[PDB]
Amino acid sequence: HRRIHFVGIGGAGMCGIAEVLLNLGYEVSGSDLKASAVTERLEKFGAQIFIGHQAENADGADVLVVSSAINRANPEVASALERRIPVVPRAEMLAELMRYRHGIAVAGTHGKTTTTSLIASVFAAGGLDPTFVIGGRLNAAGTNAQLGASRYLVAEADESDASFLHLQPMVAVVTNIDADHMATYGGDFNKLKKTFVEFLHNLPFYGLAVMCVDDPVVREILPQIARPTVTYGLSEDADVRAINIRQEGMRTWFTVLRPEREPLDVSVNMPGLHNVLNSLATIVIATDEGISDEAIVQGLSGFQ
Ligand SMILES: Cn1nc(Nc2nc(N[C@@H](CO)c3ccccc3)nc3[nH]ncc23)cc1C(C)(C)C
Ligand SMILES: [Cl-]
C-alpha cells in the first residue's frame, strides 16, 4: 500500500499525520470542505488536495483515514467501502507512525501530557528535534521542517484509546495506573491492570520499561514485566530518585540520583511533587538514550 487518502485532511488531528506520511515517502491525498493554510502547506510538501467530497477523490487510494467513525454518508468513504479499500480511524494511523521511528510511549493515567512535553524539551535541548504527540496533535519545535523528520517520536499512550495495545515503542513510561477509564475494561480494575502488563509486553526484549514505583499499582505489576526496566520515584528503593527537594519561587530544585552516576542538581519551573515525578521519568529516558547532563538540565529548566 502506497497512497493514503485523508477525509477531512485539514482537520487538526489529520494534517500532522498526513505530513509525517509525506516525510516517510508515501503518496498522500486528502479532501476538505474549505481550502486553508494547512492544506496549502501540505500541498507544498507533496499532498494532492481535493476541495469538496466526491467519490472520485478516493480513486487510487490504498487506504482511507477518517476523522472520527466511519460515517458512510460521505461518498468517498462509501466508495472505498464498496471497493474493499480499508478505512482506518485517525487514532490508529497516528499510533502506527511509531513503527517507523524510535518511539517513546508515555503511558499512565495522569501526567502523560507534561511528561511528553518534558521529554520533547530535553531531547530538543540535545539537538534531536523530536516529533511529539499531545492530545492527538503532532508537534515539533522547528516550524519549517516536516513533522517526523527526527529519528524520535514521543507520544502519549492513552489506556482508553482503541489503539493502546497496537503501539510499537522502543521505550515505554508508566507514570501511574488509576481507575478513570475502568469503563473501557468492563468496569473492572483488575482487567485494567492486566492491560498495562500487555502494553509493556509490546516492547521488544531490547526495549526499556520506565516504571514509577511510587504508584502502588505500578509497583504491584512490576515483577510481571519480562523486559528491561528502570524504576523511578521518591521511594528510597527506586533506581532513579529525587532527594533534597526545595523551592526558590515557582521553581522546584532537586538532586536526582542515578545508578553509576554522580548526583545531579536539576530544577523545573513548575511546582508539586507530580512535576518532580514528570522530571524523573524524563531524566530516565534521556539518560538511557545517552543525552548529556547539560541538555537534561537545560531542557528541564527552560520548560515553560
Ligand atoms: C500534570 N500532572 N502530572 C502528573 N504526573 C504524575 N502524577 C502521578 N501521580 C498523581 C496521582 O496519582 C500525583 C498527583 C499529585 C501528587 C503526586 C502524584 N504520578 C506520576 N509518576 N510520574 C509522573 C506522574 C499528574 C498531573 C495532574 C493532572 C494530576 C496534576
Ligand atoms: Cl474498513
From Swiss-Prot:
A Gene Ontology biological process term: peptidoglycan biosynthetic process
Compartment(s) of residence: Cytoplasm
Reactions catalysed, as given in the entry: UDP-N-acetyl-alpha-D-muramate + L-alanine + ATP = UDP-N-acetyl-alpha-D-muramoyl-L-alanine + ADP + phosphate + H(+)
Main location: cytoplasm
GO terms under cellular component: cytoplasm
Alphabetical keyword list: ATP-binding, Cell cycle, Cell division, Cell shape, Cell wall biogenesis/degradation, Cytoplasm, Ligase, Nucleotide-binding, Peptidoglycan synthesis
Sequence positions that bind ATP: G108, T109, H110, G111, K112, T113, T114
Native source species: Pseudomonas aeruginosa (strain ATCC 15692 / DSM 22644 / CIP 104116 / JCM 14847 / LMG 12228 / 1C / PRS 101 / PAO1)
Descriptive protein name: UDP-N-acetylmuramate--L-alanine ligase
Family, similarity comment: Belongs to the MurCDEF family.
Pathway annotation: Cell wall biogenesis; peptidoglycan biosynthesis
Known function: Cell wall formation.
GO molecular function: ATP binding; UDP-N-acetylmuramate-L-alanine ligase activity
EC category name: ligase
The EC number(s) this enzyme carries: 6.3.2.8
Keyword Cell cycle (UniProt): yes
